[PDB]
Design a protein around this ligand. Structure first.
Ligand SMILES: Nc1ncnc2c1ncn2[C@@H]1O[C@H](COP(=O)(O)OP(=O)(O)NP(=O)(O)O)[C@@H](O)[C@H]1O
Ligand SMILES: Nc1ncnc2c1ncn2[C@@H]1O[C@H](COP(=O)(O)OP(=O)(O)NP(=O)(O)O)[C@@H](O)[C@H]1O
Ligand SMILES: Nc1ncnc2c1ncn2[C@@H]1O[C@H](COP(=O)(O)OP(=O)(O)NP(=O)(O)O)[C@@H](O)[C@H]1O
Ligand SMILES: Nc1ncnc2c1ncn2[C@@H]1O[C@H](COP(=O)(O)OP(=O)(O)NP(=O)(O)O)[C@@H](O)[C@H]1O
Ligand SMILES: Nc1ncnc2c1ncn2[C@@H]1O[C@H](COP(=O)(O)OP(=O)(O)NP(=O)(O)O)[C@@H](O)[C@H]1O
Ligand SMILES: [K+]
Ligand SMILES: [K+]
Ligand SMILES: [K+]
Ligand SMILES: [K+]
Ligand SMILES: [K+]
Ligand SMILES: [K+]
Ligand SMILES: [K+]
Ligand SMILES: [K+]
Ligand SMILES: [K+]
Ligand SMILES: [Mg+2]
Ligand SMILES: [Mg+2]
Ligand SMILES: [Mg+2]
Ligand SMILES: [Mg+2]
Ligand SMILES: [Mg+2]
Lengths: 235, 235, 235, 235, 235
């Protein structure tokens, strides 16, 4: 279930993510003991899911008996709605109310879902009173999620809330050198600089702009440089 | 489900398609470990579908367990809309969210299909965060697909993007020669030159010209030469 | 569904239709495995529809388990538009995308019909990719059909195109002789020769001129000869 | 729907209309199995409509399940254009394309109605390939109808064409006697002979002459002879 | 709608209007069953319009269910041209093709209106084929109306034509008597005989003379005598 590229070690710290990283490690090192719940929000492609998976690995790599479960809220909704239609709701509860860490991603996808919101509420309360770790990610802070009840907003606000903001030029370059290290790549700093300057959006667009430049250098079998990089990225 | 005619074998490589060929061979050699997702775009009849079936053919033969699925985005839409009407959404999701390689063709037909775009978003995230191969083809790069949410455009720009451009005279001649050898046809080079020189459009029109010339030869029982070829293609 | 008077047995082969007839029979004997698609074009009354029924009969008679559908693009347009109004698009698609042989007459009636063009595109792609025979006819070649997208034009050009031209004096007579033979009639050669010489337009006008000669004869109850003929066809 | 005065029995056969009569009777006796289509043309007031209603009477009397529709091409035009404005085109098609016999009068009023012509085209084709009788009347041969496409002219010439030419004096007398007999009148021969001699135009003008002679007789309470006829028709 | 003073009860029969009167009553007693159409022609101020209104009143009085419409051809022309501009021709056809009796006055004003002619043709055929009464008035017989097509003039001649000729002295006297009885005046036969002798033209001028003579008498305050009449009309 846990993408194995998404560790603390592959996660680059910058000003924009420092809080969320420190909170995520606090929680990993001391599950249910440090911050419960941890609520992480922020814009598209900024590492929410990466951090959530990093908390996961850390906890498992340190307690092989720990029942650790990641899933988007869309998947939590689908399994729940199913258990009602198939009358096996008792089996959905024995699953999700007895995990040791619950990592639930993108809770904004519960908007306009009266029933799944309620079931998430009862799941949240059970896990909290049983000293289990809850980690929720969102694209926006609890106040800005519509159709949400006070009682549920109130529990999202009860632990630590951290935001993630987009990285600067320097941080984008550090994210580029980190993926390049991961595949043994010798790349000039003028290239990274050039790439990071064009792509100031999400680390996916960024990750992708690098994959291209390299793959192209490989096809034409020529050394990587800002002349090549710019050619590979016109389109 | 896969065309036996569309393999890496029957695919002639030229300057217009070298990138997409290499990318597709890499993806095929290393499912999910090389480029994920791979996104291929280009004009009419230049080998996108062929390259996608080529990836399928190779993976199934280097891993007879792998679940490999090819479909147009229009079939993905129809099957999805159906699954909601006949209240079997769980069966649609069991299939598309649990494949090892998804080959999804002509992604632009999700233009202005808000529900299906969202269903494809979650399908994508499930497969990518579980190291499954996504290959996506389009008639255009992600920045140019209308209605396309920016949430997906980004996921399309996150792996490798390759385009294919129309093959030159030399590659068209080589596509003709390759089709002829496969039907066991002995055809003079001057005829392949004649055909390749008149048809500079798409490879579908190029195959059609050869089929016409062969059929008109067979009908008038005369050996294939450049006078016959010009006679058979006048209209 | 199919005209029992429209078979290979009743189709007269001349230089003007040798190519279309040869193609139609190859398709009929080896469906999906000789030429696919087959595109037949030609002016008014030259046996396009006759040849498409003849392929229907041949395939049905030789494989009773084959799903063979003949229809005009006009009926395809109305059945589609209707399936949309009645929320029954899925019933349409289950029919036209699962046949073994699609015989679709007069595709020029899709000029100006963008929604149905897209629907025929998707039907074409599904049938071709699943090794099903497509046969399309037209009053003109693909490049002369207005409003057609390049992706659809290219699909019409990808198999064998065959044109039909107006039959010569020898073939007109052969056609008159064949109609007469079927209708138990007995007619001097000078009569066929006179009719054959006067009607050089379409086989409809030709059949019609034989029908008036026979009818004028039956009326004034005198036996058929050149003088009666010229009297009958005085127009 | 049909005129009870317009039968084969009430129709006076001359040499100018012998051929239309025979063909009409043949059609009536064997619908869809004798002449299909039957195309009748001729000048004003020579019994085209009479002959069409006569076909309709004969078929309905020998087959109560037969669906027989008589209408002018101008009524076909107004019902079509309305069915488009009122979005009920499928309701018009259900009517006209499933009749057993279609009797359409004065086809020349389709001249300059390119949309209606096309709908009639598709109506013709549907009715023809399902073995339904078509009967068309015109004031002129298919060739002489302006704006008519080739594909439609060709279909009008595919069956039996029959002209009707104005009646001779013997037939004009034979007809005046039929109308007089139909009203139980006793009228001297010299009266018919006088009228038939002064009126050589259309049977409408004949009928109106007899009506004037007879109305004048009854007004001035004197018997009908040549002198009174001559006095009544002075203008 | 209609003139309450134009009845059978106020129409003075004489030898000049005998035939037209008989025919108009014959039609009124037996709508669509005695003469269809009825064509009335004749010079100025001879009671054509009066007869047409009298038919109307009689039909309405004996049948409250009956749809009777009187109008000038000029009102028909204008309402029809208006219907085309306003795209409401369907509304024009609904009105005029579904009446039980159509009284259309002064048909000659259709001369030169080729478009209105055709509309009146089709209207005529529809009313006629559905056994509705058509009454047409004119200043001249059909052959003398210009621009009229053969097929329309034919239909004007298919029924009864009645001419009206100017009235004699006895009838002029009787008309004056009847107008004078209507107003409740004691006018000596000497006066009526003076007016009738001097006014031999149309009954409008005849009515005009009486109105002057009466008004002259009212002003001078002198009983009406034949010398008072001579001076009143002196100019
Ligand atoms: N700080 C970081 N260091 C290294 N890689 C990073 C960092 N932030 C993001 N990435 C990479 O960027 C990609 C997107 O990260 P992800 O964890 O999916 O972001 P997200 O905020 O969860 N996106 P979304 O759900 O669309 O709003 C992954 O490949 C991450 O490893
Ligand atoms: N490089 C090539 N060598 C051999 N055959 C080729 C090549 N490129 C395309 N073809 C053939 O061309 C035809 C069309 O290829 P296909 O892969 O369907 O193109 P496409 O890019 O998918 N077209 P479209 O989906 O309309 O934009 C097939 O018969 C292929 O076999
Ligand atoms: N070669 C032929 N031998 C015998 N009959 C023929 C031949 N060609 C045409 N006909 C007859 O001609 C008539 C019209 O043929 P059909 O196949 O309908 O023409 P088409 O090309 O489909 N015309 P159109 O659809 O108007 O563009 C039918 O009765 C056919 O049987
Ligand atoms: N041969 C005939 N014998 C008897 N009555 C006839 C004959 N021909 C025409 N009539 C009568 O003439 C009148 C008009 O004939 P009809 O059948 O309407 O002619 P038409 O050819 O349709 N006229 P049109 O549409 O203006 O060209 C009717 O009253 C018919 O019954
Ligand atoms: N025979 C009649 N008896 C009494 N009044 C009559 C007679 N003929 C005409 N009139 C009167 O004369 C006037 C004109 O009659 P009207 O019916 O309009 O004539 P017309 O033929 O319609 N004229 P026009 O339309 O100019 O060609 C009205 O007041 C009628 O009542
Ligand atoms: K709740
Ligand atoms: K949708
Ligand atoms: K050669
Ligand atoms: K094939
Ligand atoms: K359409
Ligand atoms: K299309
Ligand atoms: K047409
Ligand atoms: K005439
Ligand atoms: K007219
Ligand atoms: Mg995420
Ligand atoms: Mg493709
Ligand atoms: Mg045809
Ligand atoms: Mg008629
Ligand atoms: Mg008047």
């Amino acid at each position: 279930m846990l993408n194995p590229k998404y560790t603390f070690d592959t996660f680059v710290i910058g000003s924009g993510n420092r809080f969320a990283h420190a909170a995520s490690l606090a929680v990993a090192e001391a599950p249910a003991k440090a911050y419960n719940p941890l609520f992480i929000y922020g814009g598209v492609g900024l590492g929410k899911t990466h951090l959530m998976h990093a908390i996961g690995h850390y906890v498992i790599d340190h307690n092989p008996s720990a029942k650790v479960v990641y899933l988007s809220s869309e998947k939590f909704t689908n399994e729940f709605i199913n258990s009602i239609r198939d009358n096996k709701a008792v089996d959905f509860r024995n699953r999700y109310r007895n995990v040791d860490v619950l990592l639930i991603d993108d809770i904004q996808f519960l908007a306009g879902k009266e029933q799944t919101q309620e079931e998430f509420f009862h799941t949240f309360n059970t896990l909290h009173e049983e000293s289990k770790q809850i980690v929720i990610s969102s694209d926006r802070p609890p106040k800005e999620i519509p159709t949400l009840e006070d009682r549920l907003r109130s529990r999202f606000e009860w632990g630590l809330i951290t935001d993630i903001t987009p990285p600067d030029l320097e941080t984008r370059i550090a994210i580029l050198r980190k993926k390049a290290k991961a595949e043994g790549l010798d790349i000039p700093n003028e290239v990274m600089l050039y790439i990071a300057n064009q792509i100031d959006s999400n680390i996916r667009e960024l990750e992708g702009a690098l994959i291209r430049v390299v793959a192209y250098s490989s096809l034409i079998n020529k050394d990587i440089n800002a002349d090549l990089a710019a050619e590979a990225l016109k389109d």
